[PDB]
Amino acid sequence: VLSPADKTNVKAAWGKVGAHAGEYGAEALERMFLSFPTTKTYFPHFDLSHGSAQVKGHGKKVADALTNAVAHVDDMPNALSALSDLHAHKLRVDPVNFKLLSHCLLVTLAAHLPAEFTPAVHASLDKFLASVSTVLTSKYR
Amino acid sequence: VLSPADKTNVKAAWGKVGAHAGEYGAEALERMFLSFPTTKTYFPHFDLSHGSAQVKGHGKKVADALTNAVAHVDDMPNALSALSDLHAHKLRVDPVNFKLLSHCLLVTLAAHLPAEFTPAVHASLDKFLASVSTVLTSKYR
Amino acid sequence: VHLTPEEKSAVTALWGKVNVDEVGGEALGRLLVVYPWTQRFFESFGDLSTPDAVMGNPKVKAHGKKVLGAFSDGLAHLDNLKGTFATLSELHCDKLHVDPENFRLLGNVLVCVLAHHFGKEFTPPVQAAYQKVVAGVANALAHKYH
Amino acid sequence: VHLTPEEKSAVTALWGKVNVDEVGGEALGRLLVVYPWTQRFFESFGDLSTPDAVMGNPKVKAHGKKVLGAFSDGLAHLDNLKGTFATLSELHCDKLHVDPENFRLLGNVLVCVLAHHFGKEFTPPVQAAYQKVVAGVANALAHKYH
Ligand code: HEM
Ligand code: HEM
Ligand code: HEM
Numbered sequence: 285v286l287s288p289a290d291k292t293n294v295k296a297a298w299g300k301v302g303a304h305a306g307e308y309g310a311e312a313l314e315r316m317f318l319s320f321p322t323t324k325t326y327f328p329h330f331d332l333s334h335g336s337a338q339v340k341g342h343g344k345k346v347a348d349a350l351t352n353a354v355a356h357v358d359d360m361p362n363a364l365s366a367l368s369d370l371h372a373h374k375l376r377v378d379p380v381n382f383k384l385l386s387h388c389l390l391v392t393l394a395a396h397l398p399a400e401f402t403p404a405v406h407a408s409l410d411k412f413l414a415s416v417s418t419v420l421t422s423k424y425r
Numbered sequence: 426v427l428s429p430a431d432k433t434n435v436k437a438a439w440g441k442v443g444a445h446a447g448e449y450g451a452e453a454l455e456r457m458f459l460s461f462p463t464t465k466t467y468f469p470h471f472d473l474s475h476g477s478a479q480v481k482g483h484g485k486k487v488a489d490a491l492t493n494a495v496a497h498v499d500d501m502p503n504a505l506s507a508l509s510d511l512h513a514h515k516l517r518v519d520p521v522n523f524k525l526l527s528h529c530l531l532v533t534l535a536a537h538l539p540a541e542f543t544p545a546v547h548a549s550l551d552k553f554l555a556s557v558s559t560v561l562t563s564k565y566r
Numbered sequence: 567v568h569l570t571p572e573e574k575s576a577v578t579a580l581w582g583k584v585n586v587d588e589v590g591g592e593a594l595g596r597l598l599v600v601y602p603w604t605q606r607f608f609e610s611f612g613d614l615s616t617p618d619a620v621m622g623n624p625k626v627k628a629h630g631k632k633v634l635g636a637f638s639d640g641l642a643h644l645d646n647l648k649g650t651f652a653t654l655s656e657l658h659c660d661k662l663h664v665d666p667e668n669f670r671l672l673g674n675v676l677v678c679v680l681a682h683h684f685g686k687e688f689t690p691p692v693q694a695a696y697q698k699v700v701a702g703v704a705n706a707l708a709h710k711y712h
Numbered sequence: 713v714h715l716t717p718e719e720k721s722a723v724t725a726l727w728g729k730v731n732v733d734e735v736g737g738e739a740l741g742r743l744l745v746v747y748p749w750t751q752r753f754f755e756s757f758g759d760l761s762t763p764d765a766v767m768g769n770p771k772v773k774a775h776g777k778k779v780l781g782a783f784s785d786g787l788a789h790l791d792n793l794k795g796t797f798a799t800l801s802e803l804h805c806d807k808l809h810v811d812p813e814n815f816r817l818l819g820n821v822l823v824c825v826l827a828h829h830f831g832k833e834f835t836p837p838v839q840a841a842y843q844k845v846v847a848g849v850a851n852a853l854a855h856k857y858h
């Protein structure tokens with residue numbers, strides 16, 4: 285449940301992510317509203333068209349959050365506190381949506397990081413995102 | 426997450442259970458084979474019929490466990506390292522099945538605690554079994 | 567749902583001692599309390615802060631009424647659940663966009679509550695039948711987010 | 713499933729680029745590596761000990777062919793999916809008792825995989841068309857459970 289090997293691979297993947305991060309985060313949002321329209325439902329004060337500078341600005345924020353999380357992997361509950369309150373209490377996102385976004389992030393990490401995206405690596409990111417997610421929902425269960 | 430409050434009712438309610446724990450762990454098992462037959466596929470080496478002694482035997486085993494977990498409700502990750510390995514690695518039980526059992530355990534508790542199954546307790550109990558389930562499937566991480 | 571007839575009867579007969587004025591609140595209230603994110607849909611009802619808040623919410627109360635009332639209708643037309651939750655699905659999948667999983671939830675907490683009222687009477691075989699009924703209804707309000 | 717003609721095209725377009733002999737196993741292997749409890753169903757395969765073990769097992773790569781093959785029929789039948797998968801649905805539900813959740817999980821690793829091969833070419837719109845498909849396939853496979 286986030287072994288080192290796991291914390292090592294995450295690291296690399298995100299390692300090889302760099303600054304494209306913001307754009308990568310934006311790309312996942314865009315793939316998520318695309319394949320998971322309903323999700324659009326939480327972003328009504330948003331320009332959700334193809335080049336949304338808003339979407340651009342968020343993709344950044346989200347990615348930024350991941351970098352952090354990646355950075356405090358063994359302390360996420362704490363590194364991610366704030367958002368847990370934002371998401372559970374404030375936004376009240378149906379926990380489900382979390383699975384959709386990780387699937388989207390994954391699909392974008394793979395599309396860009398072909399060489400790094402390997403079963404084990406894929407397996408380690410999945411578990412990673414999986415925790416980030418669990419933490420962002422702790423306010424529920 | 427097990428808020429303090431949460432731990433209170435788990436104890437208060439489990440404590441209420443007492444020695445019926447066997448019955449209920451058997452009632453619960455039984456409830457699952459019937460409402461969800463899909464789960465019966467993991468107990469081929471058993472007689473799943475009503476009277477059944479084999480199930481009773483296993484029901485006590487479950488009850489006992491719920492017990493030792495309620496105890497160390499504070500550190501169930503260590504409190505279940507064995508069962509965890511067994512469920513994940515040996516049995517490779519699908520994580521979906523946990524949610525079905527917890528539900529039929531809930532439905533057993535409630536069946537036997539009218540004065541005590543309040544919408545607060547309903548809730549705490551619901552959280553802890555999930556806690557339990559997480560651990561029991563954490564090795565899938 | 568299928569349901570054998572001994573099932574057909576158990577669902578029923580039991581369903582016959584249900585103070586609807588009462589169960590439909592418990593159920594809609596417990597849900598709001600147990601699976602909290604469900605609250606965003608009923609922001610309008612007001613204070614849902616505590617369980618007692620939720621529980622004492624007359625709006626919560628009057629609504630659960632509406633729900634179970636739909637249940638009985640559905641419960642009456644097992645043979646063709648789709649006809650019944652006709653407009654229902656449209657509303658949830660379409661105007662509201664509520665994840666089907668939730669429907670699934672509302673159902674289980676409505677089993678959980680029957681178990682509370684009827685104690686031993688709610689039997690494993692009985693639960694079994696209801697469980698069937700619940701899946702049906704769920705799927706019926708679902709198959710409109712396709 | 714519904715699909716837009718620049719949708720229905722595009723899928724099919726990309727699909728034609730697929731090395732069927734291969735993709736099947738990258739997906740299946742990855743499923744087994746990423747969601748280990750699915751290994752239960754494939755105990756007879758040989759050694760699934762490791763990722764490489766799994767990714768390299770010939771029983772895995774061969775069956776990866778059969779599965780991708782199912783996907784091709786579906787594509788040729790983006791309407792009568794139900795009709796198309798009826799028999800498999802039987803194998804899968806009635807006999808193997810695989811949880812329907814596992815199909816969503818499979819179609820989602822094959823999406824990752826397609827993304828994997830095609831890079832920039834699997835734009836978001838492309839993904840979405842595929843998402844549609846994969847999902848239809850899933851309901852289709854899980855039919856026998858409804
Ligand atoms: C990968 C997991 C996620 C991460 C890291 C994440 C991160 C964030 C962050 C950092 C913010 C606020 C940042 C700021 O304004 O400074 C935010 C807001 C938000 N999140 Fe998430 N999020 C995640 C998942 C989700 C999901 C699955 C949804 C539901 C579709 C969601 C819905 C929202 C919405 C609507 C907002 C705020 C929009 C606004 O500012 O009006 N989030 N998220
Ligand atoms: C909170 C939920 C659960 C608890 C507390 C639990 C606990 C246990 C315990 C204590 C044992 C026996 C260990 C021993 O004999 O040393 C066991 C075995 C087993 N469990 Fe579970 N378990 C849970 C969930 C499940 C689920 C959801 C399934 C799938 C339906 C499952 C399937 C099995 C099987 C097949 C065995 C083997 C018994 C045998 O070898 O004959 N368990 N479990
Ligand atoms: C699954 C069993 C359910 C049944 C039988 C049911 C039934 C109903 C009925 C009869 C109405 C009112 C229609 C009218 O009077 O015009 C309604 C409305 C509504 N339901 Fe449900 N419902 C179910 C599940 C859910 C779930 C899971 C949610 C969200 C968590 C939900 C949220 C809503 C909301 C927001 C409304 C507002 C309609 C209004 O206020 O006019 N329902 N439902």
Ligand code: HEM
Pocket residue numbers: 750753754778779782783800804808810811814815816818819850853
């Ligand atoms: C979701 C889309 C899926 C498709 C299109 C698919 C396709 C197939 C096909 C074509 C076969 C064998 C037919 C034959 O040999 O004549 C098969 C068998 C099998 N499938 Fe699936 N599969 C899917 C999902 C799954 C999942 C998610 C699991 C397990 C979690 C699974 C487990 C199995 C197993 C264990 C067999 C054994 C076949 C044998 O007896 O050799 N399948 N599937």
